[PDB]
Design a protein around this ligand. Structure first.
Ligand SMILES: [Ca+2]
Ligand SMILES: [Ca+2]
Lengths: 165, 165
């Protein structure tokens, strides 16, 4: 058997090393974030860009006899964004609130979209600065729900209670 | 692990099929004598030329997503020549013999060298037509020894008795 197909790895995570097995290997075309460890004949590191790369191994044996393999690594994003926790909130009706920042992070290098719902009346969400602000118009309790989506469509849902008094 | 190095196979023999495993594979650069069996995702056949070939698999999955592996096949000769059997011989001293042809065959496409020794006196070997002829000058028994060598240095030894009466 010869192994064909993608070698699939997760962007922004430290990969399981890929062992090269049958000698001197010469590896090229590696994505940023990865390189080749002679001493373990392993490709290791953490890839930073989503996409496919075609990697070339030229191997030389003890008599300097040349050989060539190439294969594809596929760097994917299948992990959801993270969101800094937001505690339960309380403020007085008719008073402008201190803005609440939704801080998000993602294993991809990239921007995250937040969809916010269940907001107390009078309050609003600004997608440019990703903050909740405004002036509550009703007393009562709300559950504020945030769906954060990375560029590859992975979603996280975060909730917190808003209490207006 | 990714498999690196030569895939080594024997010239003029029917290979163990190489299974391609992880889909539509597109195979190219195969040596003469081999091709790709879709239904088994196997490379099969019998190679005829000694040497290295670099073979390319482009695989397409169910969503038509492209992938690439390449590897080297190394077609070697490690098998000795064969020689048509020659029976024990008898002829009269002072009489020219009917020439004896040494017929050889080899799994490589190529020429074989025969080294002949232990010949009864008066007899000789012609390397161009590969035949023993001449006129025996002594009565007695000889053991005639033939070393046949292929182009890769694989050797077979064949013997037969010559009786001069
Ligand atoms: Ca992600
Ligand atoms: Ca041979």
């Amino acid at each position: 058997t010869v192994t064909v197909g993608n070698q699939t790895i997760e962007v922004g995570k430290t990969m399981n090393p890929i062992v090269l097995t049958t000698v001197t290997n010469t590896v090229t075309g590696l994505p940023s974030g990865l390189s080749y460890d002679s001493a373990t004949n392993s490709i290791i590191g953490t890839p930073t860009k989503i996409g496919q790369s075609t990697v070339t191994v030229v191997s030389t044996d003890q008599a300097n006899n040349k050989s060539t393999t190439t294969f594809t690594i596929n760097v994917v994003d299948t992990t959801a964004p993270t969101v800094t926790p937001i505690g339960d909130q309380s403020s007085e009706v008719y008073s402008p609130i201190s803005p609440i920042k939704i801080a998000t992070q993602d294993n991809s290098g990239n921007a995250v979209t937040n969809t916010v719902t269940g907001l107390p009346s009078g309050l609003t969400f600004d997608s440019t600065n990703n903050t909740i602000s405004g002036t509550p118009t009703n007393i009562g309790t709300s559950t504020i729900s945030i769906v954060s989506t990375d560029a590859s469509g992975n979603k996280t849902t975060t909730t917190f209670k808003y209490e207006v008094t």
